[PDB]
Write a protein that binds this ligand. Structure first.
Ligand code: Q9R
Ligand code: Q9R
Ligand code: CL
Lengths: 233, 237
C-alpha cells in the first residue's frame, strides 16, 4: 500500500487568498506560516518519512514545504518545483476582492464563472497591474507562448497539472518512494480528481482544508483504498 | 567574463558554540549563523545577482543558509540539488568531541600532525562511537556504496569525493550558461577553490573561507578564474 501526502498552503499577505491571488507570487501571512508549522508538527508526531517532495514555483507553497521539512527534520530531501502545480491563473480578476469583482463584471457573469468548469475568466491584459509582474517573470521564460496562461478555467488548470503527475510523480510512487506534494487548492484539485475519478460537478465542490496533511493510501494501481484522512486534533 | 559563479560558506552552527567537531553531524545554524546568511543574502540582493540553479549538501546548516539566501533575493523558485558529496569533511572519531576533550586525549603533537597534514585522516568513527548510528545509519546515505560512506576523511579524501560532483554535475550546468550558486562547507568548498585556482596542498590547507559572505568567481569559457575571488558586502565586511 503506497502512502501519498498532500498539503495546501495557508493564508497569504494582504488578504490575497480572498483576492484571486492566482499566479501572483504572494508570500504567506504570519498566520499562514504558523499553519504550516502546525501541519509540520502533526506530520512529525506521527513519524512520517518521505523520500521526495514536489511543489510549485510560488513562494507560499515553497515556504509551506520548507516549514514542514524543517519541522520534521528532513530538509535534506530532494525537492522538485514545477509551474504545472501552480494555483489556477485567474486572469484579469487576480488581485480583486469579491465586491470589486462583482462591481466590475456584474453578478451574473461572476456566478457563471464560479460555477462553470471550462469558462475562463477574462485574460489578464497588459495594463493589468500584475501583467508584466507575472507574464515576464524569469521563472516562466522556458514556457512556450501557448503554455503561459493569461487566464485559466479550472479545466485548463487540471489539464496542465495532470501531465506532470503522470510523467513525474507516478514513476516515483511506483518505485516505492514516499511522496509529499505541497501545492495549491486547484492544482491539488486536479490530483484528487484523477485519483478518485470524480466528476466536474464534484471537483468544483471539493474544499480542501489548508495547512493540514492529506493522507492517501493507494493500491498497486494508484487507486485510493480508502477516503482521504487528515492529521491533527 | 563569460561565466560567473557564486559560492557561500555557512556561518556558525550550534556545535561551533560548544566548540565541538561537527563534520557529518547535522548541526543547525546558531541564531548568529542565521543572521550571517541573511546579510549574505542581502548583499546578493543589493547587487542584483540572479541564479538559475543551486547546489548544496545534505546538511541543514548549508541548506538553511541557501534557504535564507534564496529568500533574501526573492528566488525561492529556483531548482535546488542536494548531494552528500558537498558535505563538510568527516572528522571520524573526533565527531562530537570538543576542543578540550580532543587536546586532553590526543595531545598537542598528534593534533598538530592532524592539522598540518593533507592525507592523514583522524581516527575512524568506530561502531561504538556515540554518533555512529546517528550518522552512518542515517537513511540519507542509503544509496552510498560501502566504499563511499566514510568512517573518517583527510582533507584529500573530502576533496576527492567533492570533485566528482563538480565535474559530473556542476560543470555541465556552467558550460550551459546556467548561473550557479553553491551553498556548502569550508572543506568541500576548498575542493572547488583548489581545482579552480590550481592551488597546491600547502596553499589549500592554509585557506580559510569567510563565512556567510558571497564569494564571486569570474570564469572564462574554460572555467579559469580571470581575477581573484571577490566578496560582496559593505566596505567593512
Ligand atoms: O601558549 C601555549 O603554550 C599554547 C598551548 C597550546 C596547547 C596546549 C595543550 C594542548 F594539549 C594542545 Cl593540543 C595545545 C596551544 C596553543 N595555541 S595553538 O598552537 O595555535 C593551538 C590552538 C588550538 C589547538 C586545538 C584546537 C582544537 C582541538 C585541539 C587543539 C591546537 C593548537 C598555545 O599557544
Ligand atoms: O582549517 C583547517 O584546515 C584546520 C584543521 C584543523 C584540524 C584538522 C583535522 C584534525 F583532526 C584536527 Cl584535530 C584539526 C585544525 C586547524 N587549526 S587549529 O588551531 O588546530 C583548530 C582546530 C580545531 C578547531 C575547532 C574544533 C572544534 C570546533 C570548532 C573548531 C579550531 C582550531 C585548522 O585551521
Ligand atoms: Cl529546497
Amino acid at each position: 500500500a503506497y502512502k501519498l501526502v498532500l498539503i495546501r498552503h495557508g493564508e497569504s499577505a494582504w488578504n490575497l487568498e480572498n483576492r484571486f491571488s492566482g499566479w501572483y507570487d504572494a508570500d504567506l501571512s504570519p498566520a499562514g506560516h504558523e499553519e504550516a508549522k502546525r501541519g509540520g508538527q502533526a506530520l512529525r508526531d506521527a513519524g512520517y518519512e518521505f523520500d521526495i517532495c514536489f511543489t510549485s514555483v510560488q513562494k507560499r507553497a515553497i515556504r509551506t514545504l520548507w516549514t514542514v521539512l524543517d519541522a520534521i527534520d528532513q530538509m535534506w530531501l530532494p525537492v522538485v518545483r514545477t509551474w504545472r502545480l501552480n494555483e489556477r491563473h485567474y486572469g484579469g480578476l487576480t488581485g480583486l476582492n469579491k465586491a470589486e469583482t462583482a462591481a466590475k463584471h456584474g453578478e451574473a457573469q461572476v456566478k457563471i464563472w464560479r460555477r462553470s468548469y471550462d469558462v475562463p475568466p477574462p485574460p489578464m491584459e497588459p495594463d493589468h497591474p500584475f501583467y508584466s509582474n507575472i507574464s515576464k517573470d524569469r521563472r516562466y521564460a522556458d514556457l512556450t507562448e501557448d503554455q503561459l496562461p493569461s487566464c485559466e478555467s479550472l479545466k485548463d488548470t487540471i489539464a496542465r497539472a495532470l501531465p506532470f503527475w503522470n510523467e513525474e510523480i507516478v514513476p516515483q510512487i511506483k518505485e516505492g518512494k514516499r511522496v509529499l506534494i505541497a501545492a495549491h487548492g486547484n492544482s491539488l484539485r486536479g490530483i484528487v480528481k484523477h485519483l478518485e475519478g470524480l466528476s466536474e460537478e464534484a471537483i468544483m465542490e471539493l474544499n480542501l482544508p489548508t495547512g493540514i496533511p492529506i493522507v492517501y493510501e493507494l493500491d498497486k494501481n494508484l487507486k485510493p483504498i480508502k477516503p482521504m484522512q487528515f492529521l491533527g486534533d
